[PDB]
Design an enzyme around this catalytic site. Structure first.
Site, mmCIF file in Angstrom:
data_model
loop_
_atom_site.group_PDB
_atom_site.id
_atom_site.type_symbol
_atom_site.label_atom_id
_atom_site.label_comp_id
_atom_site.label_asym_id
_atom_site.label_seq_id
_atom_site.Cartn_x
_atom_site.Cartn_y
_atom_site.Cartn_z
ATOM 1 N N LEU D 16 0.818 -1.201 0.000
ATOM 2 C CA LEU D 16 0.000 0.000 0.000
ATOM 3 C C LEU D 16 0.856 1.257 0.000
ATOM 4 O O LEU D 16 2.019 1.244 0.416
ATOM 5 C CB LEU D 16 -0.886 0.089 1.239
ATOM 6 N N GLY D 17 0.232 2.355 -0.418
ATOM 7 C CA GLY D 17 0.764 3.685 -0.176
ATOM 8 C C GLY D 17 2.253 3.777 -0.388
ATOM 9 O O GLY D 17 2.769 3.267 -1.381
ATOM 10 N N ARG D 38 -0.109 -7.786 5.755
ATOM 11 C CA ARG D 38 -0.869 -8.644 6.657
ATOM 12 C C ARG D 38 -1.960 -9.448 5.943
ATOM 13 O O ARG D 38 -2.395 -10.470 6.485
ATOM 14 C CB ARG D 38 -1.470 -7.807 7.825
ATOM 15 N N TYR D 155 3.822 7.299 18.945
ATOM 16 C CA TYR D 155 4.457 7.417 17.636
ATOM 17 C C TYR D 155 5.768 8.199 17.713
ATOM 18 O O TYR D 155 6.808 7.727 17.241
ATOM 19 C CB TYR D 155 3.472 8.088 16.686
ATOM 20 N N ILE D 190 2.166 12.808 3.599
ATOM 21 C CA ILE D 190 2.084 12.245 2.260
ATOM 22 C C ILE D 190 0.633 11.849 2.000
ATOM 23 O O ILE D 190 -0.043 11.312 2.887
ATOM 24 C CB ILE D 190 3.027 11.028 2.103
ATOM 25 N N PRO D 193 -4.276 6.752 -0.167
ATOM 26 C CA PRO D 193 -5.722 6.436 -0.106
ATOM 27 C C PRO D 193 -6.285 6.487 1.303
ATOM 28 O O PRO D 193 -7.447 6.885 1.490
ATOM 29 C CB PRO D 193 -5.782 5.031 -0.736
ATOM 30 N N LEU D 194 -5.489 6.154 2.316
ATOM 31 C CA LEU D 194 -5.967 6.266 3.695
ATOM 32 C C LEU D 194 -6.294 7.721 4.043
ATOM 33 O O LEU D 194 -7.420 8.025 4.449
ATOM 34 C CB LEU D 194 -4.917 5.680 4.638
ATOM 35 N N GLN D 251 10.761 25.285 9.814
ATOM 36 C CA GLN D 251 10.257 26.377 10.632
ATOM 37 C C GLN D 251 9.988 25.880 12.061
ATOM 38 O O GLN D 251 9.791 24.694 12.299
ATOM 39 C CB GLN D 251 8.990 26.970 10.000
HETATM 40 MG MG MG Z 1 9.209 23.671 13.971
#
Ligand code: MG
Ligand code: MG
Lengths: 251, 251, 251, 251
Positions: D16-17, D38, D155, D190, D193-194, D251
């Protein structure tokens, strides 16, 4: 209290805002201070507002003036003794993109923000090395040493230069056992009478997309981290970047 | 003096080396401290060596033990009042490359160095937010959060995870006006009785290609920067990395 | 092949070493190139060694010469069409600590390494913006933009300035939809005929404490990452630092 | 074309992706590819959509499954020959602050994003070292390996861990002359499709305060930088971070 006992400090741009707060806390902690500035009437009144001439004095100096740096070290030496501490805090800002910077704006900003720091660091090392002073050179950078701003091109360049040139000097002093440390301090947006003079500035600066705390800081927020770096508490810190920015560069 | 007046601090791994120095200076500055450790006989003797039970106490805890974190906050609350300060300092190290790390070594190191920090930070936010305490979570990282070491694979991973997870928590607390700050402290090589127990270690660590100062640091070098971050002097610092490493990561 | 179809590139310091390799690969991939240099006899021979005048030409220029930058863009325009690509690769190095840098050494190094890059970037934006060219400004930095070297003070300052000034320009171009990207490339130690002219240099550079791979790189190692950044493959990369350094800055 | 001649690549999450784009370009450039995923019905259809079984095949695997990593290397070996290239691209995301992460969410995210990468890197080194293959391990990180996000706690931790653990492995391979490189790739936002399945997501991501280009990127933006790192063009790059993020972290 007495965290800066026996230290002799020069602070450039020390008559106003951030630099005057650093001067104030440096005196409260037992340091002797020479502040510099471009205007005598402001500088003599500033120095008197902090303490008496045995504690703090003023010297008229443009930090871009090479020969004046020698006079400044001599006068501090004559007044207070061998210098142990230099805070290269004087700076100017131009609100232009790289695309819209004129060459006279470029040169004028680098003479103060980058040449000046060079002249102060170079002479600091020469005068403070090998004297058992516990010498410390605090080079004022800012968040714009880490991240770009579309409207501070020449500023970004000067604060990135000071960030990495300070690491060069830190290593050389450490490797040659000079008893000098060099570090950079990176304020985020700080409230100063100048900012108060720009309607809506602090409002724009305090937005969560800029400063996550939703407010900007105060001059003492920078004074307290300079105390730490001027004192022997930080004798194992050199070549490092100390950021006090309300979360700005975390996102 | 009195820089930590009114603060209530937990310090994990607080019976030895770095963490015991932090505990000591936290008490000298007016904070009430609970130190943790895995062994009662060391921890009760350590706590008595610093001060009296109205100042500092010991709680037996493995920082990888989720349910024990609740007991630890309750007991500190019962003993000293609402907690304002958490130093996630407990850690373990494995001397293996990524190639030679077994999965049991991996899991065991992450349970202490990364799960533990998570459990302490998560519960810290929940218990310290919105109480006008001037709350501060100091998450102990190290130079290995910045740079790789060929023989500290799982350690590098845990200290990189703690570096960036601390910035997530710092932002959320800042954006929700929780009155909690989160920062990471990154020691270089520090002399501890454990290092003294490895013939030639400190010698290898003090080489200029590793530590430019030619020596390693001492536990108080880390205690002084935790004082700064525990106190209201640093109320505008969140999400930042504070490095005290003798020049290690400057070259 | 044909990865740089239709592009028109200027490469400063393009007659030797790194910059001549970039020129060579830029031509192999379909770009039209103008290389600059201080000496006509080297530059005309270099340009002829790569290809024919419909592909690559030479223009005599000192990158510290502001007015010459205008002539250079005009001549490239007249010869090949609108410029899409600028590689600010010309530089000089001084082997001095900050302590031992004279002010003439300082100014002379900043005129090339920092003013020159500024002049090239400023004019690049003005001439390449808003033309559907897929414009790219690759600003040559180096590992010394990240880390200090005790004997490259003024160099460290110039490469730190270029690192962060490039992020300012990148943002402004992105926010104003200029269709210009700005990025920096940071070589480690690279073998060039100049290095071969220093007995023992490459030996000192190849030591594991400096370059973990145990060897230094080659000019094409930098040419391939400039190809990537000059081409539309990298249309989503701006403001970023690309390091090709054999592991130098990883430890 | 033929930039990946002779290479044998595994790509985790390759159906995917982002990972499917990398697989596609890896095949266009002459590499043989095994993609994992999976679900068999998606993975067999994905692999057929790219090319024929002599070019690309699918293997059912959960990257958190240690024992399955061995089967995966064996099957790729049996199908295509010795593996030269591993892209640890499989990941999952949880939209929770550190404060609101449950321990089951924590463990489940680290099993895929951090354990999995460890298992793939550890076995990659063991199987690719010392074979003259020009081996390359591309470890998929993201901007959240650099900066915090208030709602991606676990994450952030996994992508910071992978950033610094990859530098450890890179050094060890370089110092032991293993002929393996390890690098991390850090996409910004990015389009996949998700994302298209979340009304308003891409709109929120494309705001200038997040992505200065005012838009988000596309899967090929990541495929092209993996090509560069999989190929011998990048033989002098190891331990480095490659950011393709539209300006996000500038930034
Ligand atoms: Mg920053
Ligand atoms: Mg290093």
């Amino acid at each position: 209290s007495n965290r800066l006992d026996g230290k002799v400090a020069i602070i450039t741009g020390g008559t106003l805002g951030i630099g005057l707060a650093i001067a104030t806390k440096f005196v409260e902690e037992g340091a002797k201070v020479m502040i510099t500035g471009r205007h005598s009437d402001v500088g003599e009144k500033a120095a008197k507002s902090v303490g008496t001439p045995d504690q703090i004095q003023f010297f008229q100096h443009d930090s871009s003036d090479e020969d004046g740096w020698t006079k400044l070290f001599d006068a501090t030496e004559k007044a207070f003794g061998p210098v142990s501490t230099l805070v290269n805090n004087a700076g100017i800002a131009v609100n232009k993109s790289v695309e819209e910077t004129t060459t006279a704006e470029w040169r004028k900003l680098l003479a103060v923000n980058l040449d000046g720091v060079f002249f102060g660091t170079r002479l600091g090392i020469q005068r403070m090395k090998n004297k058992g002073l516990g010498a410390s050179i605090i080079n004022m950078s800012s968040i714009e040493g880490f991240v770009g701003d579309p409207s501070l091109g020449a500023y970004n360049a000067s604060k990135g230069a000071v960030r990495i040139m300070s690491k060069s000097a830190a290593l050389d002093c450490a490797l040659k056992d000079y008893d000098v440390r060099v570090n950079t301090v990176h304020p985020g947006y700080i409230k100063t009478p100048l900012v108060d003079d720009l309607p809506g500035a602090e409002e724009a600066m305090s937005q969560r997309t800029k400063t996550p705390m939703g407010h900007i800081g105060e001059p003492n927020d920078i004074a307290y981290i300079c105390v730490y770096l001027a004192s022997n508490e930080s004798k194992f810190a050199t070549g490092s970047e100390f950021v006090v920015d309300g979360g700005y560069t975390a996102q």
